[PDB]
Amino acid sequence: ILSTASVLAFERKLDPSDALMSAGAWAQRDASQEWPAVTVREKSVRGTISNRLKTKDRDPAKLDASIQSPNLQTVDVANLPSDADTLKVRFTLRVLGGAGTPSACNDAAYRDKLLQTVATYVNDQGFAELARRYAHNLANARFLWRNRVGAEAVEVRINHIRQGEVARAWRFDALAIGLRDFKADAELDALAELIASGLSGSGHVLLEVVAFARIGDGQEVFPSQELILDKGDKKGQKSKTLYSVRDAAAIHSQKIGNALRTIDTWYPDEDGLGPIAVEPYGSVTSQGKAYRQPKQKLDFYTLLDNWVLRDEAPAVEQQHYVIANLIRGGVFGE
Amino acid sequence: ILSTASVLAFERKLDPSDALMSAGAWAQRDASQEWPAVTVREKSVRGTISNRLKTKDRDPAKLDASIQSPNLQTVDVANLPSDADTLKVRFTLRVLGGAGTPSACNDAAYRDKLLQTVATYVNDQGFAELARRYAHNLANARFLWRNRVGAEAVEVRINHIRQGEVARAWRFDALAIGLRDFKADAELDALAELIASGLSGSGHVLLEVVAFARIGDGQEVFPSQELILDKGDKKGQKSKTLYSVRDAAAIHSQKIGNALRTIDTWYPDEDGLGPIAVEPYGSVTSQGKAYRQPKQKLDFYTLLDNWVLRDEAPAVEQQHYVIANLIRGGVFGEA
Amino acid sequence: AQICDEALQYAARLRELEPGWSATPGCQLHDAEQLWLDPLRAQTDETFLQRRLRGDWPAEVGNRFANWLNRAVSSDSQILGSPEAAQWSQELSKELTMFK
C-alpha cells in the first residue's frame, strides 16, 4: 500500500526580504534613492493603571488603589521627520519555481506519486490563478500592515530586475485595488504572467518592490515589533521592541510573506470577508478563528492525502489551496 | 584462500575545508578580499500551528484551541545586506594521491593483492574519468546547495596555489555547466588533468575555490544547519542552529565533500535522473532510496570482493565506482 | 545599596534550595521573612496561600531588616533611631515590591 512519507520538507517559494523603511516628501518619489531611513527611538511614557485589576486575594481598596498613582513605561517608537509625509518601504522578492518537488522525502514511491500529481496539476492548468492573486497582493500594498489604514495615497512600484538593470517596471495605485476582491487589469495580468513564468520554472524572476504612502507630517510608522517574552518577576521591563536593520526601522520578512501569501478566498464560511493566509488548518491567530478545521474535510492535510494517495482529486479551488500551501512550504509527515 | 582483511582503513582523498560565506556586490568580484562576512542572527518568530496533530489520545478542545492560538519559535537566519546582491563562498581543497594504499590492514597478502588490483586499474587507465567528473562537480557550483536554486548567475573561480600564490586560474559560468550532463571544455579537462596528476601522486595540488552567486538585495542565504544531538532535542527551545566558524556563516566541510562526490552516474536503476554521491550501498537519505542495494550484485562490497579475492573484474564503470569509493575512503573489513 | 543587594542575592541563592518548605520550627522571626524567600509559584498549584500577595511581607521585611541594621550598626554615636529605620525599611521595601 502507498502511505505518506514520514519526512516531507517543502522549500519556500516566493522568498521575500526584510522590508526597510525610509521617509521623504511626496512627488519626490522618483529620486527616492537617498531618502533618510526611519530610526527607532526609545521614549519613556507616564500613564494610568489601565487594565482589569486582579481582585482575588489582594486588599479590597487599599493595595488595589494603585490607581491615583501613575505607572512609568519605556517603549519604542518610529516616527517620520517633521518635514516628511511619505513612508517608503522597499524589499526584494525571488520567485523560484519547482513547487511540488520536496527537498526531502523518505518514501520514494510517495515522492513519485506526488510529483506526478503536481505535474498533472501544472499541465492541465497553469500557474494562472495563484500568480494572479499573488500579483494582486503585490499590487495593493498589504505588506504595509498598519501603515495602510490611514493613508490617502499608496503607490507601489515593482521592477523586474534582469541583470543589474530593470526590464519591466509596473506602477500601481494600491488604493484603487481593494484588499478583498481580485479584479482584472491590463498591467496586472502581465505581472501575473511573469510570476507564473517564475513559478513554473520558465525563467528566473527577481522583483524589487517599493511602496510609498502619504500618512502625514511627523506621524507614527509601525514597523515589526520584536518578539520578546517578558517575565512576571523583576518587573519594570521594556515591553515594546521594534525590529531594526542597522539603524533603520523595518518589517520582518515573514510579515511580508504573510501579506503576500493571503490569497485564500475558499473556506466554507465566507460570504465576502476577504482572503486569508494559506496555512495548513488555515487560521488567523490575531482574529482568533481557525478556518478549515479538521472537522470539515477542507484541511490541507485531508485534501492532500485524498489527492495524492486515494486519487480523489478535489475541486479546482481546493487544488489552488493545496498548491498554494506547497508554494509556501513546510514540514509534513507521520 | 585469501579472505579479506579484518580491518581496512582508507584515508580521505579530496580533502575540503569549511566554506566561509561573505557578501558583496556583483561586477566588483575581483576585489572580493575584504568583503564583510555574512553573520548568523537569531530571531524569534510567531507562526500558526501547522503540523499533523496527534489526535490519537488528546481531547478535541485542546487541539482546536491549539490551532487557533499561535506558537512562538526561535530560529537562526543569515541574510545578505540591503546593498549586497552577491554571496561569495570560499573554501580550499587538497588532493592527495596514493588512493589505493590503505592505512590499516590485518592480512598482508590481502594488502599486496589489493595494491596489485589498484595498480592494474591505474596502468590500464589513469584517473581521467574520475578527475573529469570531480572537475565537473567543482566547475558547476554544486557545493552551493540551496544557495544555487534561485541564483541569477553563478561564477566559480578556481586557483591553483603553487607556493602561497596562484599559478593557474580557471573561471567558470556555473549555470551553463549543468548538474547532470558531463560535457567537455578546454578549461574543464585542463582542470581534470590537474586533479588527475594530483590523484596519481605526480604533484602537490591545492586549490582555492571561490564561488559568487547573484541572489539579490537582502535575500536569505543558507549555511549548514548544525546537528544538535542529545543536548537540545528535549523541549524545542531552539529550533534551528546554523553553523558559524568565527562570526561568519559557513558551510560544513563534509557537505562540500558530499557535493564533490556526486559523480556516480552508474547504478542498476535509471541513470537519467542524474548523478548521486559515491557511497557503499549508494544512498540518498534525503531522497529516501538506496541505489546499489546488496540484492542486485552492484554495491561496493560485492564488486570489491569479486575484484580482489576471486579476481573477476567487473564492468569498467563499476570499477570506476569502486575506485571512487577508495578515493572517498572509509572503514571496510569483515569480522 | 551593597547591603540590600546582598540581601537580594541571599534571597535569590536560597531560591535554589526547594520550592516547598513547611512549618519547620523557629517561627519567632520567621513569618514576615517567611514569604520574602519566595515559594517558587510551582509547589502552590491551587493557591493554598492567601497572604502571598496581600502585601504583608515587604514593609515588615524592610522594618525588621532595618531593625537588624539598627542593632548591628551602632558606633560611638550610640543611638541610630527610628526615622533611619523607616528610611532603610522603605528602601528595601521599594526594592522588594520592584519584583512585580
* C42 and A CB contact within 8 Å: no
Q: Cα(C2)–Cα(C88) distance, rounded to whole angstroms?
A: 13
Are A139 and A156 contacting, i.e. CB atoms less than 8 angstroms apart? yes
Phi, psi of B207 (to 5 degrees): -120, 150
DSSP A40: E
- Please classify residue B326 by burial: count the beta carbons closer than 10 Å to its beta carbon, then call 0-12 exposed, 13-18 middle and 19+ buried: buried
* A231 and C CB contact within 8 Å: no
Are A39 and A242 contacting, i.e. CB atoms less than 8 angstroms apart? no
Same domain, A254 and A318: no
* Helix residue spans in chain B (DSSP H): 60-68, 108-124, 128-139, 186-200, 253-260, 300-308, 316-328
Paired residues of A21 in beta bridges:
A89
**In this structure, is the dihedral angle defined by the CA atoms of residues B303, B307, B311 and B314, taken in order, positive or negative?**
positive
Are A39 and A250 contacting, i.e. CB atoms less than 8 angstroms apart? no
Same domain, A272 and A296: yes
Type and span of the H or E element at A124: helix A108-124
Are A224 and A240 contacting, i.e. CB atoms less than 8 angstroms apart? no
Residues 6 or more apart in contact with residue A244 via CB below 8 angstroms: A39, A40, A223, A250
Q: Which three cell numbers stand for residue B44?
A: 524569534
Q: Among A57, A233, A235, whose Cβ lies nearest the Cβ of C54? A: A57
Are B80 and A245 contacting, i.e. CB atoms less than 8 angstroms apart? no
Q: Cα(B276)–Cα(B321) distance, rounded to whole angstroms?
A: 11
Are A260 and A131 contacting, i.e. CB atoms less than 8 angstroms apart? no
Paired residues of A94 in beta bridges:
A15, A206
CB atoms within 10 A of CB A27: 7
Determine if residue A137 is left, alpha or beta; phi over 0 gives left, psi from -120 to 50 gives alpha, anything else beta. alpha
How far is Cα of residue A30 from the mean position of the Cα atoms in its chain? 26
* C75 and A CB contact within 8 Å: no
DSSP C59: H
Out of A262, A279, A305, a domain closes at: A262
Same domain, A163 and A105: no
Query: SS in 3 state form for B5-70?
Result: CCCEEECCCCEECCEEEEEECCCCHHHCCCCCECCCEEEEEEECCCCCCCCCCCCHHHHHHHHHCC
Q: Which three cell numbers stand for residue A34?
A: 537617498
CA dihedral A61, A67, A68, A73 (to 10 degrees): 150
- From C23's Cα to the closest Cα of chain A, the distance in A is 22
A236 interaction partners in chain C (CB closer than 8 Å):
98
Are A14 and A205 contacting, i.e. CB atoms less than 8 angstroms apart? no
Paired residues of B79 in beta bridges:
B220
The structural domain count of chain A equals: 2
Same domain, A40 and A84: yes
Place of cell 491551587: C46
Paired residues of B128 in beta bridges:
none
Radius of gyration (C-alpha) of chain A in whole angstroms = 23
Are B211 and B158 contacting, i.e. CB atoms less than 8 angstroms apart? no
What is the domain extent for residue A272? 1-11+99-126+263-334
Q: Report which of B102, B24, B90, B121 is spatially closest to residue B251, judged by C-alpha positions.
A: B90
CA dihedral B315, B320, B326, B331 (to 10 degrees): -50
Q: Which three cell numbers stand for residue B195?
A: 586533479
Are A58 and C54 within 8 A, CB to CB? yes
A233 interaction partners in chain C (CB closer than 8 Å):
99-100
Residue count of chain A, please give it. 334
- Please classify residue B233 by burial: count the beta carbons closer than 10 Å to its beta carbon, then call 0-12 exposed, 13-18 middle and 19+ buried: exposed
Same domain, B79 and B226: yes
Type and span of the H or E element at A132: helix A130-139
- SS3 assignment, position B161: strand
Same domain, A86 and A173: yes
The structural domain count of chain C equals: 1
Residue of C nearest to A64 (CA): C54
- From B65's Cα to the closest Cα of chain A, the distance in A is 9
B128-149: b or e for each residue (b if 16 or more CB lie within 10 Å)?
A: ebbbbbbbbbbbbbbbbbebbe
Q: Report which of B330, B15, B17 is spatially closest to residue B204, judged by C-alpha positions.
A: B15
Measured distance between the N- and C-terminal CA atoms of chain C, rounded to whole angstroms: 20
Q: Report which of A93, A18, A169, A195 is spatially closest to residue B215, judged by C-alpha positions.
A: A93
A56 interaction partners in chain C (CB closer than 8 Å):
47
- SS3 assignment, position A16: strand
A14, A238, B64, B202 from B16: Cα distances, Å? 33, 47, 50, 20
Residues 6 or more apart in contact with residue B229 via CB below 8 angstroms: none
Q: Cα(A219)–Cα(B170) distance, rounded to whole angstroms?
A: 55
Residue count of chain B, please give it. 335
This structure's resolution (Å) is 3.4
What is the domain extent for residue C45? 1-100
Same domain, A42 and A172: yes
Q: Report which of B126, B290, B101 is spatially closest to residue B198, judged by C-alpha positions.
A: B126
* C81 and A CB contact within 8 Å: no
Are A106 and B218 within 8 A, CB to CB? no
Are A332 and B220 within 8 A, CB to CB? no
**In this structure, is the dihedral angle defined by the CA atoms of residues B291, B294, B296 and B302, taken in order, positive or negative?**
positive
A63 interaction partners in chain C (CB closer than 8 Å):
54-55
B247-271: b or e for each residue (b if 16 or more CB lie within 10 Å)?
A: ebbbbbbebbbbbbbbbbbbbeeee
Q: Cα(B98)–Cα(B106) distance, rounded to whole angstroms?
A: 19
- SS3 assignment, position A167: strand
Place of cell 568565527: B246
Are C74 and C81 contacting, i.e. CB atoms less than 8 angstroms apart? no
Phi, psi of A68 (to 5 degrees): 65, 20
Place of cell 577508495: B326
Phi, psi of B291 (to 5 degrees): -70, 160
Q: Cα(C88)–Cα(B190) distance, rounded to whole angstroms?
A: 84
Residue count of chain C, please give it. 100
A243, B157, B165, B211 from B161: Cα distances, Å? 44, 13, 5, 16
Same domain, A278 and A257: no
A66-98: b or e for each residue (b if 16 or more CB lie within 10 Å)?
A: eeeeeeeeeebebbbeeebbbbbbbbbbbbbbe
Q: Which of A233, A234, A237 to mutate to test the interface with C (most CBs of C within 10 A)?
A: A233
Are A155 and A170 contacting, i.e. CB atoms less than 8 angstroms apart? no
C53 interaction partners in chain A (CB closer than 8 Å):
57-58
A104 interaction partners in chain B (CB closer than 8 Å):
286-288
DSSP B276: B
Q: Cα(B23)–Cα(A28) distance, rounded to whole angstroms?
A: 31
Same domain, A89 and A74: yes
Same domain, A57 and A29: yes
Phi, psi of A327 (to 5 degrees): -70, -35
Same domain, A179 and A84: yes
Q: Cα(B209)–Cα(B144) distance, rounded to whole angstroms?
A: 12
Out of B207, B239, B262, a domain closes at: B262
DSSP C7: H
Q: Which three cell numbers stand for residue C87?
A: 528610611
Same domain, A4 and A83: no
